[PDB]
Design a protein around this ligand. Structure first.
Ligand SMILES: *C(=O)N1C[C@H](NOS(=O)(=O)O)CC[C@H]1C(N)=O
Ligand SMILES: [K+]
Ligand SMILES: [K+]
Ligand code: NA
Length: 263
């Protein structure tokens, strides 16, 4: 069937000119609302959640791992590295790299997480270990953001990412202290106020990870603690037909508003 919420999301998508993917999980009753929920979208920086979580999982058996220094060299800098560039010729710990990757979306930091996991396939392997058969990471930063229509590299579906985000942040894919650390990082994101949370009541608490790339790709994945109800998990992915298209964070906000109005 097609619900009123799904029809509104389709109208939003039609006005936007692009392709919108939405997946909500309401943990009050485990119900789901999906729009293009099984179509693939380029993850861009939203893939950093899986990489940081995979390192958190490694840290469960290595109490000192997150304090291990990682050397940052001039050649490690890529296209967006506001934190890592302050540490060139120095070191950052895996905790610092995770925080920078998640909260500032530093791309050099993401590459250090990927390298710690043995390459993009190590991120995919972690996804499989936690029951996500859909996620794939194939490249490092910055090429993982090419976002070419029809290209399966570095993609997932809204349904799969919402399920994984739930398991990581509210479920038991990670140990208790690691889950809390991931939640703390997401709640401290600096980049999210124009995306999902712009469409939600201001009294609700949000932790999220945004992303963007070529083809005007504009993404956000969020855990939401609304006023007076159990948490929600919401993924909004958006991509456009031309390579140089502008970001449309407003579309993600609009999708979130439609979702919230349908609760
Ligand atoms: C992630 O998608 N990226 C990293 C950086 N920050 O944007 S974010 O805050 O939306 O994550 C620049 C854009 C993008 C990229 N091209 O790597
Ligand atoms: K961006
Ligand atoms: K609901
Ligand atoms: Na772009």
């Amino acid at each position: 069937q097609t619900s009123a919420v799904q029809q509104k999301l389709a109208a939003l998508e039609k006005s936007s000119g692009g392709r919108l993917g939405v997946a909500l999980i309401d943990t009050a009753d485990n119900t789901q609302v999906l729009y293009r929920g099984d179509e693939r979208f380029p993850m861009c920086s939203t893939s950093k959640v899986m990489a940081a979580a995979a390192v958190l999982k490694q840290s469960e058996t290595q109490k000192q791992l997150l304090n291990q220094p990682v050397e940052i060299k001039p050649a490690d800098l890529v296209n967006y590295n506001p934190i890592a560039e302050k540490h060139v010729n120095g070191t950052m710990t895996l905790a610092e790299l995770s925080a920078a990757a998640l909260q500032y979306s530093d791309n050099t930091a993401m590459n250090k997480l990927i390298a710690q996991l043995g390459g993009p396939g190590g991120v995919t392997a972690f996804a499989r270990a936690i029951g996500d058969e859909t996620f794939r990471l194939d490249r490092t930063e910055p090429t993982l953001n090419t976002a070419i229509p029809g290209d399966p590299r570095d993609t997932t579906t809204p349904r799969a990412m919402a399920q994984t985000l739930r398991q990581l942040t509210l479920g038991h894919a990670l140990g208790e202290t690691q889950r809390a650390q991931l939640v703390t990082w997401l709640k401290g994101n600096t980049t999210g106020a124009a995306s999902i949370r712009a469409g939600l009541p201001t009294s609700w608490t949000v932790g999220d990870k945004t992303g963007s790339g070529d083809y005007g790709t504009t993404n956000d994945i969020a855990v939401i603690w609304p006023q007076g109800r159990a948490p929600l998990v919401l993924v909004t992915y958006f991509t456009q037909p031309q390579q140089n298209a502008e970001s449309r964070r407003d579309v993600l906000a609009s999708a979130a508003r439609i979702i919230a109005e349908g609760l």
